[PDB]
Design a binder for this molecule. Structure first.
Ligand code: SAH
Length: 382
């Protein structure tokens, strides 16, 4: 253990993706269970103070620069100064806020984002509002439904924790557009996970584009608003977006059309259900990015099967997903459990290989993002 202690010690000497990972592992080593439990409990109180002070517009009342008294803050937001102080003190002690003197509060780099509506503060809100209750409900959920991996769009941990297990997550939300708004803004933060253009080379697709002037190039299966297609084609004249196909449910496709500027360059648009047969045959590339992790292996096999039958011998299927290492990293282990609250999971390359093989495909290679585990798994017909 004395080496990591030294590794981090030389890291902190220069200080005066893993710059701070070793600081997590060092903390783990030295702490005993009772220090772990107090740290965990402090996390829950810290997030609660964060959520309330965002909700009550306190961070907004605190100037980005300079100092303001607790009294003045409380008068601005119209709230009991004692309650404002007690919750601020949680953030002072953890270093999210900074106290000057006995009575004065101020922002830090770590708290300024919470002073406005933005993807970070949106993520804070949905985490507290849309995932924490599901995690807290997990002991009762697994007593109620059986201690097995949760899948299916009804009776999610999330719907259970909200008191209506018969609703889907989307039905639950379409009843309150405010929750809708927070969720959509929050997902913008990682709307650009690492992109194909760069991480994957489509030069060979241009050669296919010339050799067959007639065939579909890239089909983005469940591609939402088609940001990934736009990025791939943007400045490649041999990769024409007009030869590509954006597929998603009819409701989201309709929104794509209703929110697109006239005369803009667009892929073909096709409303469809990727649990049923794939309408576009023989394309060069089928891309399914961040979709399979919402589903059981069995549903993933059905989805991939439709793609395999539509694919030609020289077609490739690109699966854009996190590929867990065995054991997984902290943030991907974390997401793995969050996905369980909504009926999904992350997977190792072995688990993907089992699902891919069952769909009559085989994994030809994997391109992994630098400094993370998000990958494109390149598959071809078996
Ligand atoms: N049955 C279905 N058929 C087609 N699309 C579906 C679907 N069920 C969910 N989706 C779509 O799958 C997407 C999952 S989110 C992933 C979006 C995009 N690939 C990205 O990289 O961010 C959503 O756009 C959703 O509309």
């Amino acid at each position: 253990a004395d080496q990591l202690d030294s590794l981090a010690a030389l890291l902190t000497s220069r200080a005066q993706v893993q710059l701070v990972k070793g600081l997590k592992d060092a903390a783990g080593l030295v702490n005993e269970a009772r220090e772990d439990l107090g740290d965990l409990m402090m996390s829950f109180v810290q997030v609660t103070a964060l959520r309330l002070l965002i909700k009550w517009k306190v961070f907004e009342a605190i100037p980005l620069e300079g100092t303001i008294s607790y009294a003045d803050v409380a008068a601005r937001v119209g709230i009991d100064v004692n309650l404002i102080t007690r919750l601020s003190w949680v953030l002072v002690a953890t270093g999210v806020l900074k106290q000057d003197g006995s009575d004065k509060i101020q922002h830090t780099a770590r708290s300024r984002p919470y002073a406005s509506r933005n993807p970070l503060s949106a993520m804070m809100i949905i985490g507290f509002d849309e995932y924490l209750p599901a995690l807290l409900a997990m002991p009762g959920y697994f007593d109620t439904y059986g201690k097995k991996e949760p899948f299916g769009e009804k009776h999610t941990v999330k719907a259970f924790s909200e008191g209506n297990p018969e609703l889907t997550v989307n039905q639950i939300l379409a009843s309150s557009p405010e929750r809708l708004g927070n969720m959509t803004l929050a997902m913008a933060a990682m709307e650009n996970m690492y992109p194909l253009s760069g991480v994957y080379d489509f030069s060979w697709v241009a050669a296919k584009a010339a050799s067959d002037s007639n065939r579909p190039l890239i089909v983005d299966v469940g591609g939402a608003k088609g940001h990934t297609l736009q990025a791939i084609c943007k400045d490649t004249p041999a990769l024409p977006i007009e030869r590509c196909v954006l597929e998603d449910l009819p409701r989201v496709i309709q929104v794509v059309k209703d929110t697109s500027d006239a005369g803009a360059q667009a892929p073909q648009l096709l409303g469809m259900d990727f649990n049923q047969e794939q309408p576009v045959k023989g394309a060069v590339v089928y891309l399914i990015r961040r979709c399979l992790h919402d589903y059981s292996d069995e549903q993933c096999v059905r989805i991939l099967g439709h793609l395999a039958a539509a694919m030609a011998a020289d077609s490739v299927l690109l699966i854009g997903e996190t590929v867990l290492t065995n054991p997984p990293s902290r943030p991907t282990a974390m997401m793995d459990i969050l996905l369980a609250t909504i009926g999904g999971k992350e997977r190792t390359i072995d688990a993907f290989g089992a699902v891919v093989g069952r769909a009559g495909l085989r994994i030809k290679g994997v391109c992994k993002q630098e400094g993370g585990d998000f990958s494109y798994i390149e598959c071809v017909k078996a």
